[PDB]
Amino acid sequence: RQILAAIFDMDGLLIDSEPLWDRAELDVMASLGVDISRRNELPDTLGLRIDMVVDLWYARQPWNGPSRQEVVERVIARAISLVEETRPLLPGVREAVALCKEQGLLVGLASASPLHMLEKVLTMFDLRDSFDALASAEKLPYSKPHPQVYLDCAAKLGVDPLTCVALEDSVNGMIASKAARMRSIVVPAPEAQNDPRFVLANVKLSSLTELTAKDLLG
Amino acid sequence: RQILAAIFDMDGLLIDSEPLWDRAELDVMASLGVDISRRNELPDTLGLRIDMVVDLWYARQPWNGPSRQEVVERVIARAISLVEETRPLLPGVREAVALCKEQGLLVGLASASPLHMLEKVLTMFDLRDSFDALASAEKLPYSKPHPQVYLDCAAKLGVDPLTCVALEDSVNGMIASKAARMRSIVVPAPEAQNDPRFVLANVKLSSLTELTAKDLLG
Ligand SMILES: [Ca+2]
Ligand SMILES: [Ca+2]
Ligand SMILES: [Ca+2]
Ligand SMILES: [Ca+2]
Numbered sequence: 380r381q382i383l384a385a386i387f388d389m390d391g392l393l394i395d396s397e398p399l400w401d402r403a404e405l406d407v408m409a410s411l412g413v414d415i416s417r418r419n420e421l422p423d424t425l426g427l428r429i430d431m432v433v434d435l436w437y438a439r440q441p442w443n444g445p446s447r448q449e450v451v452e453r454v455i456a457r458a459i460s461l462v463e464e465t466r467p468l469l470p471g472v473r474e475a476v477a478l479c480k481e482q483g484l485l486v487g488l489a490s491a492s493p494l495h496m497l498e499k500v501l502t503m504f505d506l507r508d509s510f511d512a513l514a515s516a517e518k519l520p521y522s523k524p525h526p527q528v529y530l531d532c533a534a535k536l537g538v539d540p541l542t543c544v545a546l547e548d549s550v551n552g553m554i555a556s557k558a559a560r561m562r563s564i565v566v567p568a569p570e571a572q573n574d575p576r577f578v579l580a581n582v583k584l585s586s587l588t589e590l591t592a593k594d595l596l597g
Numbered sequence: 598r599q600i601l602a603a604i605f606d607m608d609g610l611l612i613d614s615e616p617l618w619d620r621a622e623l624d625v626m627a628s629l630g631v632d633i634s635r636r637n638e639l640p641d642t643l644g645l646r647i648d649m650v651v652d653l654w655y656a657r658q659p660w661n662g663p664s665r666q667e668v669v670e671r672v673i674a675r676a677i678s679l680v681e682e683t684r685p686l687l688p689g690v691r692e693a694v695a696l697c698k699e700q701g702l703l704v705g706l707a708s709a710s711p712l713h714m715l716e717k718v719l720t721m722f723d724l725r726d727s728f729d730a731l732a733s734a735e736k737l738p739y740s741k742p743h744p745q746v747y748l749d750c751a752a753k754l755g756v757d758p759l760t761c762v763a764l765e766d767s768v769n770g771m772i773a774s775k776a777a778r779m780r781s782i783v784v785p786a787p788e789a790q791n792d793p794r795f796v797l798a799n800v801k802l803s804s805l806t807e808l809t810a811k812d813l814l815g
Binding site: 521524558560575576579 | 742
């Protein structure tokens with residue numbers, strides 16, 4: 380398999396945003412009167428688009444006032460403010476992106492988060508220039524684990540999805556890359572460390588600091 | 598997870614057609630002058646749509662005369678004749694489908710094979726009446742492991758994909774069902790035995806004769 384491009388996941392892979400999304404969700408849900416202690420009633424939501432999480436909450440504990448979409452955009456805005464404020468770049472990111480270029484690869488971003496947030500996070504770490512294409516799953520009918528966002532990214536990159544390696548922190552994200560028939564590297568979130576399903580990935584890293592050219596190219 | 602429907606894979610799951618497809622591909626490729634001994638050069642193609650397989654051969658050893666699409670149609674026609682001839686219903690099928698109905702489920706079919714072939718195989722085993730919906734990936738941009746065919750089946754059935762259990766014999770088919778966010782039961786092909794990636798399935802059966810109500814509903 381000939382690798383021409385590397386596509387990075389964003390939340391929990393490039394940035395330590397999972398705690399920040401949690402906080403944004405918590406704060407907004409609490410403001411609506413939603414009983415948060417019942418968080419255990421929801422399925423695992425790691426890697427799921429925010430709209431799916433808000434829908435899950437709304438199915439357990441409906442609320443009045445703002446619609447689910449209005450709640451989605453409040454959570455998004457809050458998560459973004461938290462990201463700007465803390466600048467949570469994960470270890471090894473800068474080096475990993477550089478390595479991709481050193482190894483002759485195009486570089487993409489494929490995320491469930493809105494395109495404006497993708498642009499914002501990359502620009503804030505002076506990484507926008509290194510990314511040849513960005514793809515958001517926001518407007519799409521289905522986000523990860525549906526492969527559409529990854530296929531869109533490959534198309535914007537101008538390469539066959541088969542020539543891509545996707546770096547992910549979640550099972551849902553990994554499945555999206557495999558449903559697109561891509562090579563997969565995972566750097567599992569702390570919340571997912573010993574998930575047996577990561578056996579589907581081609582490479583498993585404890586951190587992006589450990590990333591090598593062999594991991595990328597096979 | 599409340600299960601409302603069961604969607605069966607076709608080839609290798611309901612019918613023992615994988616060896617018949619092999620024979621159809623072999624015979625057609627041999628007629629084109631294609632050096633069959635180099636079959637080892639292709640990747641694992643289990644569960645891939647025939648067009649992808651023809652493209653894989655054509656990339657290695659491009660022939661003249663019939664186009665890839667003309668070759669696809671020739672292989673399909675040969676495969677169908679072989680199925681009609683041998684009528685290779687796999688063990689436990691009729692009982693599995695009956696079990697689904699006894700457990701209150703709608704029944705779907707989702708396959709990479711052409712719709713006309715799906716109608717033919719079902720009608721040939723007096724199973725067409727038991728199936729509430731059929732979905733073929735033949736006309737789609739991407740077949741399994743892309744989830745589109747499974748999502749189309751769920752839509753034709755009239756249920757949320759989250760309420761579906763997909764029965765598959767391949768990793769590629771399983772990934773498609775998991776990319777659609779469905780429950781997964783696998784009855785691994787003889788070729789795919791011991792594939793570690795079946796750990797993603799919710800249930801793994803050695804045969805459909807082993808299918809129980811608990812496997813379907815969880
Ligand atoms: Ca992620
Ligand atoms: Ca170089
Ligand atoms: Ca830069
Ligand atoms: Ca199959």
